[PDB]
Structures are given as structure tokens and as C-alpha cells.
């Protein structure tokens, strides 16, 4: 038997256990998102710590990030999204970057994953 390493092994939610993602994989989900008519958006932040409170159920700190510009309403091609990512990477090179999606009929997000690490 082998032992799972407990020291310095952070995880970042969805698609963090599968092998690293490539640019082809990246520009494959953006298309799946577009085929179902959803609005993309980008977010950035320099830390990922989680904080709690003494006696308040359902309260956690560190859930909100910072929005890049504005949701890309009326976007029908993927290329544009990839260019905007390179702009964000050039702007702040010491932060995490995330990609989101939005459904206005049930008012809820649909996916999220990380594309850059410090």
C-alpha cells in the first residue's frame, strides 16, 4: 500500500485531481459553455485562505474575488475570451485567475476553474 501525502498539498476544487490541463482542453470547455448560451466572466485574487466565525452557521470568509471588467454579454466566438486572459495575465503576474459562467433563467453560475497560478 502507499500513503497519501499530507504536507503542503492544496487543492482548488473542480478539475484539480485530473492531470494538468492544456490550451486545447481549455478552449474546449469555453465552447461547451457557449453552445448552451451562457455569459463568461473573469476574476482575480492574491490569496485563497478561508476564515470562520465563533458561532454563526453558514458564514465563511474568502468567497468573493475581484471582477476583471464586465460580463461579456453577446459573445459568440471563443478566441476573444483567450485574448482577454493574456491581458489579465500580463497586468497582474502574482495572482490567481478564474473563469466563470452564468445562467439568467435560474439565476445561478454553471462552472468555474483555475487557469493561472503564481
Amino acid at each position: 500500500m502507499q500513503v497519501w501525502n499530507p504536507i503542503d498539498n492544496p487543492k482548488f476544487e473542480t478539475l484539480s485531481y485530473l492531470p494538468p490541463l492544456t490550451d486545447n482542453q481549455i478552449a474546449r470547455e469555453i465552447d461547451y459553455m457557449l453552445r448552451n448560451k451562457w455569459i463568461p466572466c473573469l476574476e482575480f485574487d492574491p490569496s485563497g485562505t478561508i476564515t470562520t466565525l465563533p458561532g454563526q452557521p453558514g458564514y465563511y470568509g474568502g468567497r468573493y474575488w475581484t471582477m476583471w471588467k464586465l460580463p461579456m454579454f453577446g459573445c459568440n466566438n471563443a478566441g476573444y475570451v483567450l485574448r482577454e486572459i493574456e491581458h489579465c495575465k500580463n497586468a497582474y503576474p502574482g495572482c490567481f485567475i478564474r473563469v466563470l459562467g452564468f445562467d439568467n433563467i435560474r439565476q445561478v453560475q454553471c462552472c468555474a476553474f483555475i487557469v493561472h497560478k503564481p
Partner: protein
């Protein structure tokens, strides 16, 4: 001729029901339909007792159909006025509709199938405490189904040992953990120590990975005072979720708890125990979809819906219909899935379904297809029966789900190409390889007794 009005124009504030009946030999059908309506309301077809307005307080039959394929089987429709029910009480409704019609001798069997609740009666209930969207926003988890596990053996383990297993299981990659339904307070382990050890394990596990974790704490008790005492402690410690059994406990107690949970911001998980005593035979009892509707009205966040490939009975089409009834907002009539009436929920939140009962890795592609990414999957023996341990077992379960989700997104099939997906993934995961070799030929196939 009286309790059978074959033209009545059903109003929009009435409650409708549909029974299937098995009359004795000789009894004419349009005669038994009129007896069910009266025996469920006043109990007469004459006016010897009225002259005291009646009529405005009686149910009436308005349609009859024959069941195709069986020579002795019929469907009866009955309408009930609105002023017969008390607002905000499921106990009353159940007592008024079903409480005497199942002992009628002139019949041999009876089964209730469906009910239509008008919006003028649904608005007097509170409903689920939070719903679906609010819970996902609170937990900060999007894009994939959630995972969980139950602890075993049931009965026998101490509190320190119980907590040592939760940590190793939780540190491996799962999201939730649960107590067996028959664990309340026993001589070998009392509740107030189990709560503390579980809380410590949860904090230690959360500090490590960097994601939000939780565990369902059982709150069933023998008296209302004890049940309410066991929830204030959970509120004090800051735990996010609790659990309750609603069929052996009661509807009165479930409603009191739902109110408390809405008031103090907790999440409620429901377990369906003893339900198989009522809905397994196909000619006597009450179908499960009625109980699901009743629970959605009473209040809850999760509910067990059953699998279709496990150790317990369950059919596909029937399940696909009631799951839609549980989650959606507007449902159309469809007799090919067991839906008899059109239902409107006038903006009431939904309920997450849960699947559990003898399942392993070679069952992921199917589950992921029957249910979307709006469910919870549980695995008890599939994690604690891994040749290595609990952490290695949890990692194998998460990798399979991630691979299936990626394959679905890339635009590949799942019913035709499923075994391949699992194999290509074991080529780079030393934990998934071990599990696949242990459970290769373990399936469950028997004849269904509740076909349709």
C-alpha cells in the same frame, strides 16, 4: 347517480385524486366509484340526514377509465371542495382523504396514485428552508455532482474511533459524511461526546485541504424536548447541517423542526425509513410520489430517491418522472412516466435528490447520465472496503467522477463508451487500479415486482 356526476366541471380551487380499484365479482364499476367518494366524505347518497346547505361539503366522482391489459382494474377520479381542509397542516389532509376507505369490504384492494394541489392551497405553507440555489451559493461549489460516505460498522464503535475515521475519510477528497439512521444515543456511545469529536475532526480536516466540509448529525429522539435540545448544541458549535427521519418520527415534529431550521439558518437532510411497508406491492398502499409531494410541502432540503443498479428495488421511467416532479417548477401531463395531473408550484424552491445502496466505481458513467449535475452520490462500503485505507479509497472515487465529467463535456457518449473511460484513467492513477480489480463482476439483477 348522485355521488357520481359524469359532467361536473372541476373548479380551480379543488383537490383531485386518482385511485385504482379491484372490485369483487358482480359489483358494477360505476357503483363502486360512487361508494369511494361518499365513504371518503359524508357516507350517504340520500338526504335523510341533511335539511339542517349540504352539497357544498361532499366529494363527487366525475370520470372512470378501464386499465388496458387487465380484465378487473379501473381508475376513478374524485374532486373535493376547498373548505374541507385546515391551512398549513399535512396531518389533517392525510386524515381527511385516507382514513376509512381502505377497510371497505365490497372491494378487494385499493391504491392511491396521484394528487393535484391548487395554488390557492399551496401558498399557506412555508416550504423548504433554503432550496437549491441558496445552498450551492453558501457552499461555493459549482459544476459537478457532490460526493459523500456513511460510516460502518453500524453499532459497536466508540466516539474517539468514530472521529478518527471521519478525518481520514474527509482528508481524502470527499465533501460530506453521515451517521447511520439507527444511531441516536446508546450505552456504548452517547451523543454529546460524538458531537465534540466530530467537530474537532472537521476543523482539522478543513484547515488542511482548503475547502469547506460538513457532516450530517442525527437529531431523532423520543420526545420533542430532547429533539429540540440536540439542535441548539449544533447551532452553538457552528455546524452547518443536521438530519431527521420523517416517517417514524412524525409530520408534526418534522414541521416544528423545519420552522426552527429556517429561523436559525441550518440545512436539513431527510431519510425515508419504513416507506417500503407502504409502497412496494402494485395493488395496495400509497405510491411514493405522493409522499414526495407531501414532504416538499412540509419542508426539507435533501431526500433519498434510490438508485436503479443497487441492492434495493427501483424502476427507471417512474424515477425519471418523480425526480422531475421534485426538482422542476412546471410539469406537464405524461402517462408514459406515471403522471396523471398537471402541476404548478407558483415559485416554490426545489429539493436535491440523493442516490445510495450498494454501488461502486463501475457504476459512475450510468449514474452521471440518469441524474445531471444536480444530485448527491453516497458510497459506504466502496470507501472503507478498499484494500489500502479510507484516504486511498476516497481519492479513487473522486478521480472517476472527474474523468466522467470531462468526457461528458468533450462531447463523447456514456452508455456506449463507458468501460473505456474508466480504463484509460486507471493508467495514471495507482489507487483507481486497485479498486477496479476487487469489484469487477458484482451486479444485482432480479425480476421487478412493482413494474407499472
Amino acid at each position: 347517480l348522485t355521488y357520481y356526476t359524469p359532467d361536473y366541471e372541476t373548479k380551480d380551487t379543488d383537490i383531485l385524486a386518482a385511485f385504482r380499484m379491484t372490485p369483487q365479482p358482480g359489483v358494477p364499476p360505476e357503483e363502486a366509484g360512487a361508494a369511494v367518494a361518499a365513504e371518503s366524505s359524508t357516507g350517504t347518497w340520500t338526504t335523510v340526514w341533511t335539511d339542517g346547505s349540504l352539497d357544498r361539503y361532499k366529494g363527487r366522482c366525475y370520470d372512470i377509465e378501464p386499465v388496458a391489459g387487465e380484465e378487473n382494474q379501473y381508475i376513478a377520479y374524485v374532486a373535493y371542495p376547498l373548505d374541507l381542509f385546515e391551512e398549513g397542516s399535512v396531518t389533517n389532509m392525510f386524515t381527511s382523504i385516507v382514513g376509512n376507505v381502505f377497510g371497505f369490504k365490497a372491494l378487494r384492494a385499493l391504491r392511491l396514485e396521484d394528487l393535484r394541489i391548487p395554488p390557492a392551497y399551496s401558498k399557506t405553507f412555508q416550504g423548504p428552508p433554503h432550496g437549491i440555489q441558496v445552498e450551492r451559493d453558501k457552499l461555493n461549489k459549482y459544476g459537478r455532482p457532490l460526493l459523500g460516505c456513511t460510516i460502518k460498522p453500524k453499532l459497536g464503535l466508540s466516539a474517539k474511533n468514530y472521529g478518527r475515521a471521519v478525518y481520514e475519510c474527509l482528508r481524502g477528497g470527499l465533501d460530506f459524511t453521515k451517521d447511520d439512521e439507527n444511531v441516536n444515543s446508546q450505552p456504548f456511545m452517547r451523543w454529546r461526546d460524538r458531537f465534540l469529536f466530530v467537530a474537532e475532526a472537521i476543523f482539522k480536516s478543513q484547515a488542511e485541504t482548503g475547502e469547506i466540509k460538513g457532516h450530517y448529525l442525527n437529531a431523532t429522539a423520543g420526545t420533542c424536548e430532547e429533539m429540540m435540545k440536540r439542535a441548539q448544541f449544533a447551532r452553538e458549535l457552528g455546524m452547518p447541517i443536521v438530519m431527521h427521519d420523517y416517517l417514524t418520527g412524525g409530520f408534526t415534529a418534522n414541521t416544528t423542526l423545519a420552522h426552527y431550521c429556517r429561523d436559525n439558518g441550518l440545512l436539513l437532510h431527510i431519510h425515508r425509513a419504513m416507506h417500503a411497508v407502504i409502497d412496494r406491492q402494485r395493488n395496495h398502499g400509497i405510491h411514493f410520489r405522493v409522499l414526495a409531494k407531501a414532504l416538499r410541502m412540509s419542508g426539507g432540503d435533501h431526500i433519498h430517491s434510490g438508485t436503479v443498479v443497487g441492492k434495493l428495488e427501483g424502476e427507471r421511467e417512474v424515477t425519471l418522472g418523480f425526480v422531475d416532479l421534485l426538482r422542476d417548477d412546471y410539469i406537464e401531463k405524461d402517462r408514459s412516466r406515471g403522471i396523471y395531473f398537471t402541476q404548478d408550484w407558483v415559485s416554490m424552491p426545489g429539493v436535491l435528490p440523493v442516490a445510495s445502496g450498494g454501488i461502486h466505481v463501475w457504476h459512475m458513467p450510468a449514474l452521471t447520465e440518469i441524474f445531471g449535475d444536480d444530485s448527491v452520490l453516497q458510497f459506504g462500503g466502496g470507501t472503507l472496503g478498499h484494500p489500502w485505507g479510507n484516504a486511498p479509497g476516497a481519492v479513487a472515487n473522486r478521480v472517476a467522477l472527474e474523468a466522467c465529467v470531462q468526457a461528458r463535456n468533450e462531447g463523447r457518449d456514456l452508455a456506449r463508451e463507458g468501460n473505456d473511460i474508466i480504463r484509460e484513467a486507471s493508467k495514471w492513477s495507482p489507487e483507481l487500479a486497485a479498486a477496479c480489480e476487487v469489484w469487477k463482476e458484482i451486479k444485482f439483477v432480479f425480476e421487478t415486482i412493482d413494474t407499472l
